[PDB]
Structures are given as C-alpha cells and as structure tokens.
Design an enzyme around this catalytic site. Structure first.
Site, PDB file in Angstrom:
ATOM      1  N   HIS A 236       0.853  -1.113  -0.072  1.00  0.00           N
ATOM      2  CA  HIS A 236      -0.154  -0.102   0.024  1.00  0.00           C
ATOM      3  C   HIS A 236       0.676   1.438  -0.066  1.00  0.00           C
ATOM      4  CE1 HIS A 236      -0.152  -0.197   4.700  1.00  0.00           C
ATOM      5  NE2 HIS A 236       0.135   1.089   4.290  1.00  0.00           N
TER       6      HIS A 236
ATOM      7  N   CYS B 286       3.568   1.767   9.275  1.00  0.00           N
ATOM      8  CA  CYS B 286       3.500   0.556   8.392  1.00  0.00           C
ATOM      9  C   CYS B 286       4.815  -0.003   8.063  1.00  0.00           C
ATOM     10  CB  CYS B 286       2.536   1.088   7.276  1.00  0.00           C
ATOM     11  SG  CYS B 286       0.909   1.647   8.026  1.00  0.00           S
TER      12      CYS B 286
ATOM     13  N   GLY C 248       2.756   6.454   9.765  1.00  0.00           N
ATOM     14  CA  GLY C 248       4.101   6.124   9.431  1.00  0.00           C
ATOM     15  C   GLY C 248       4.877   4.908   9.943  1.00  0.00           C
TER      16      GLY C 248
END
Ligand SMILES: Cc1ccc(OCC(=O)N2CC[NH+](C)CC2)cc1
Ligand SMILES: Cc1ccc(OCC(=O)N2CC[NH+](C)CC2)cc1
Lengths: 304, 304
Positions: free
Chosen positions: B41, B145, B143
């Site tokens: 993503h 991820c 942030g």
C-alpha cells in the site's frame, strides 16, 4: 492508536553487555569506552555475603582475577577501582559499539527500560519505574546482576540503573552507574524491608490522558477539584502528592485533550472512591502508574 | 523473581529497518540480504485507497520510484515484485547487519515482539499476541506501517508480522512476511469489523503457573475439573477451548509447581465465576493472556 507498555529499542545497550567473572561468580558488565562497570559484589564469597568488607575483599584481588568476555572473546583488564557499589574495570580495548551515553540518577516515578542479561547475553527488554520506595519490580533470575536500566534520547543512551539484588519480598534494588544505591539498600545478604509502595499519581494522570487520546473516556466525569482536595484523597489511597510541578508537566496533555489537569484529577478521585466497577482503561483493570507524562507524549507523537 | 511483559532484545531487527518512500508516502521496510520488504500500500494514492487495484497501480511504478534509505544513505533498487500484500524491492547491496532469520506464519495466541518504527527509525519495542480474531492490539501511529513482529531463537530472528493498517476500532491488522494477512482483512480503506476477541486460555494458565512460581498463590483452590467441564465454563466466558495439545504444552509448568493442569483449570474456573474480588495476580487485576507457556518457561529459566 493503541497504548502499549513500550521499552526503548535495546540494540545500543546490547552492544555494551559483557560477562564479568571473579572466582566462581559470573554476572553482567557494561562496557563503555575502555571501562567495564559491574556490581562490586562480583568479588563476594559465601563466607562474607552477610557482612562483606569490600575494601578488604578487593586487597585479595588483582586485574587478572577479573575475567571479562565480550562474546566468545576475552578483554585484557589493565586496572580496577571501586566507586561506591560498582567496580570499574579498565580494559585495553575501547568498546567499538560504545553509543553516545550519559550516567543519570533518576527520581522516583521515572520510567526506564531494562535489558535483562545472563552471562553478558541479552534475554529480554521491559519497561519499569523507580518506585517511590526506590525499589523496582523487575524480572531478574540469578546471573542477571549488572543488567542495566536506560532511557534513549534519539541516539544518546542515559544509563540510570544497574541491577544488584532481590529483597526477601522479591522486589529489586540497584545503583546508578556511579554505584550509589537507589534508596537505603546495601549490597549485603541481610533481610532489608522496602517502605510503602505508593502509586505515582502524575503517571496515573498521564495514562488517563493517554486513555482519552486513545478513545477510552468512560471514566471522565462532570467534576473538578483543587490540588489540596485531590491530595487529601491521594494520601488516603497511598498515592504520591501532586505538586504544581506535576500539573505543569501535564500541560501539553491537558492542551491536546482540552481536559484541565484538575478536572482529570477529579476523574481520578472518583476512580479511587468508586473503583472501576469491572470496567477497564487501556485494557487494565487497575490504574497504571509506569508511564510518565514524557512517555505518553513520546508514544502519542511517535518520537524515534 | 518477578514476572514482566518482556520483549526480545530488538538490536538484530533495528539493523534491518529502512525507510521506503513511493511518491509522498513514507513507511518502513525490512532489509534482509539484498531484499527490502514493505507493505504494497506504499504505492496507494488517496483516489484508489477505497478500491485499490494493486497490479494496475504497480504498472505506473518503476524501480527508481521506490526510494529506500538505510540511515542518511540511499539504496539502489534493481528490481521490484509484489508477493500477496508485500512489495519485495531488490537492492544492489546485501544488508551487512542481516541476522540469521526465518519467515514464520504464527497461530492465534502466539506472542511476538514489535519494533515500532517511523521513517525507518526504531521508536519502541513491546510484546503482543496474535488475538484469536487475528488482530493485534498494538501501538501504531501514521508512518508505522512496515514495522515488524518477531521472535528470537538465540541468534535466529523469526519474522512473523508486518504492520499494514488500523481498523476503525483502532486494533491492528497485518501480514506475515509472505504478504498474507492474518485473518480476513484486506489492505483497503473500507470499514472492516474484527470478530470476537476471545481470551487465550492456555496463555492464562501459563501466567497462573508463572504467578505460583513467583509466590502469588492466593487464587489456588481445593478443586479440580475435567477438560469438558472446564471448556463449558471457558465458552461461557469467551475463553478459547483448551485442547489436550494445550495440556501437553503446560506439562513442564505442571511438573515444576506440582499443580496438575486440570487443577490449575479448576482454579481458573473459580476466578472466572467469582472474579478477583479486588485482588491482583502478578500486579494485574485481570487475567493476562499475552504470555505463552514457552514465554513463561523462557522468562522463569533465563534463556538468552
Ligand atoms: C548483595 C548480594 C550479593 C550476592 C548474593 O548472593 C547470594 C547467595 O550466594 N546466596 C545463595 C545461598 N543462600 C542460602 C544465601 C544467598 C546475595 C546478595
Ligand atoms: C490499507 C491502507 C493504506 C493506506 C491508508 O491511508 C489512509 C489515508 O490516507 N487516509 C487519510 C484521510 N482519511 C480521511 C482517509 C484515510 C489506509 C489504508
């Protein structure tokens, strides 16, 4: 979102852990520059543990009596000195993994990370607070002595704790990295009692703010109080007195949530008086006091 | 003595964290050998987050569109491929700090350490469990991820989790390092509900054993039960069924404490039925289920 009991990343401290052996005793040392710091009780024998005279024990010791191993490789000890309750072993090699570092003596209620180590090898990292009775509630088995407590400011490691012993009640006592005990404890195998383990009020308030920030708000009430009224309730429940210095430190959490510090104090007062009634806050059924206002801001802002 | 929610030392994983940027999105990547793993993503735009067609988004992407930074120094991307919900970025440099490692897909109830990271920089380490509904209850800000979950066997890092997203309820979903989601979740900005968050029974029993080992024994009772009777109570209280496989795994804790597994089950049954009555176990006012039998043996034996 989410609020976790979170330790500092331990890598910078892992690179400083060594094994120290004197005679048949092995525990952990901290290798910074060309010095290895460890508990002075590494020299202690079964005979002397009751009333050890460390200066006398150390007369019988030479540099070559201290075996320092960093991995499966030995360090040459070229000097040793006692500073309060720590041994400083001068080695001929500066630790190449020495991080930027400070030694700090923390106040009660301050939190830090512990890297629990055995034979100079890291087993685990956890977060804890210096209790108001200057004990900590750690997880330490035999061989964990010399394991250290730290805080990490970006890339600078502030060492605040070295593990030395377990009280008969299974709570933990240790020193700063100058070898000065937190609290009235001595590195001696005599029964020693801790004082009242009071709740760190400012830390509970910080964690209540964390709860609101994370959408746990059931406990927020219609009331306010004053520092004097709050503190009367605090004292009755073995909570540490809240000072204006504490109110000042909670200012940014107040500002973020729009809940005045004294309003949050009134919410806490009702939680003390009424209990939680089987409800949880941030997945705890009791009021958590091992997050500082700094920890809550850090975790709720993502500082690295 | 003492029993703490303890993470693995994070040093070996700190050395693998990098920043990945695609367009205006920055999150974390895991750099092992000459591959950087991150959430796919990272390529997602505001437009497509509702119904992203990742294969179509990736057509618009080249190697030079993926910016990989390890410190204040950039890695050259020489290939990229999608495996399920992860991007694998081939770089021209093998991570020199690559630990011995495996990718494992864990079962619900299994615990791991999370190194929470922002811009490829570690902020914190905490312990958590894969919930029976295949969510985790983390601490993740924007942030985070690409932050990973791991277990450490001596010197070998088993990577089990990569962080991908937060559900509208603020619980966390992610993948194994092959990019396969735990649970029925998809890397899409659609409302997705978690199922029943049941209690990990075997883990509660392990932590009851830890409690006895650590001298918290008030809850031990005069009763036993059977797996069938226990499981009737379990199901009523949203506890996972206990299998003979669980009883088998608890064998060493049974052996150490001399408390038969079914006796500890009967103690747990009374704690479910009667509650804790304002008492604590290992400083918790509720039954803790984020220690595995393995974690309890490890912490109670001092494995490094
Ligand atoms: C400050 C300090 C340093 C070392 C200690 O070692 C304890 C020990 O060797 N024992 C094992 C045998 N027990 C019967 C008595 C205690 C204790 C305290
Ligand atoms: C799987 C996944 C990946 C990236 C995501 O980014 C969320 C985002 O950019 N938002 C900010 C603005 N909000 C109004 C809507 C959400 C969400 C889910």
């Amino acid at each position: 979102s989410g609020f976790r009991k979170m330790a500092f990343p331990s890598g910078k401290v892992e690179g400083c852990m060594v094994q120290v052996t004197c005679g048949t005793t092995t525990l952990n040392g901290l290798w910074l520059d060309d010095v290895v710091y460890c508990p002075r009780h590494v020299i202690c024998t079964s005979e002397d543990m009751l009333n050890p005279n460390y200066e006398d024990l150390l007369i019988r010791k030479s540099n070559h009596n201290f075996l320092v191993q960093a991995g499966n490789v030995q360090l040459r000890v070229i000097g040793h000195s006692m500073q309060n309750c720590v041994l400083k072993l001068k080695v001929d090699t500066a630790n190449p993994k020495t991080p930027k570092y400070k030694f700090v003596r923390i106040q009660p209620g301050q939190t830090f990370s512990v890297l629990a180590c055995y034979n100079g090898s890291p087993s685990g990292v956890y977060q804890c607070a210096m209790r108001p009775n200057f004990t900590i509630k750690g997880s330490f088995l035999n061989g964990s002595c010399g394991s250290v407590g730290f805080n990490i400011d970006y890339d600078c490691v502030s060492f605040c704790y070295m593990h030395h012993m377990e009280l008969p009640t299974g709570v933990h006592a240790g020193t700063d990295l100058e070898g000065n005990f937190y609290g009235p404890f001595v590195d001696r195998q005599t029964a020693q009692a801790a004082g009242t383990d009071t709740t760190i009020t400012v830390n509970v308030l910080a964690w209540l703010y964390a709860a609101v920030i994370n959408g746990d708000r059931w406990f927020l009430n219609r009331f306010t109080t004053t520092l004097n009224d709050f503190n009367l309730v605090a004292m009755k429940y073995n909570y540490e007195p809240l000072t204006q210095d504490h109110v000042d430190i909670l200012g940014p959490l107040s500002a973020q949530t729009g809940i005045a510090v004294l309003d949050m104090c009134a919410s806490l007062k009702e939680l003390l008086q009424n209990g939680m009634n089987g409800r949880t806050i941030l997945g705890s059924a009791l009021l958590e006091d091992e997050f500082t206002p700094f920890d809550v801001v850090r975790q709720c802002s993502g500082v690295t």
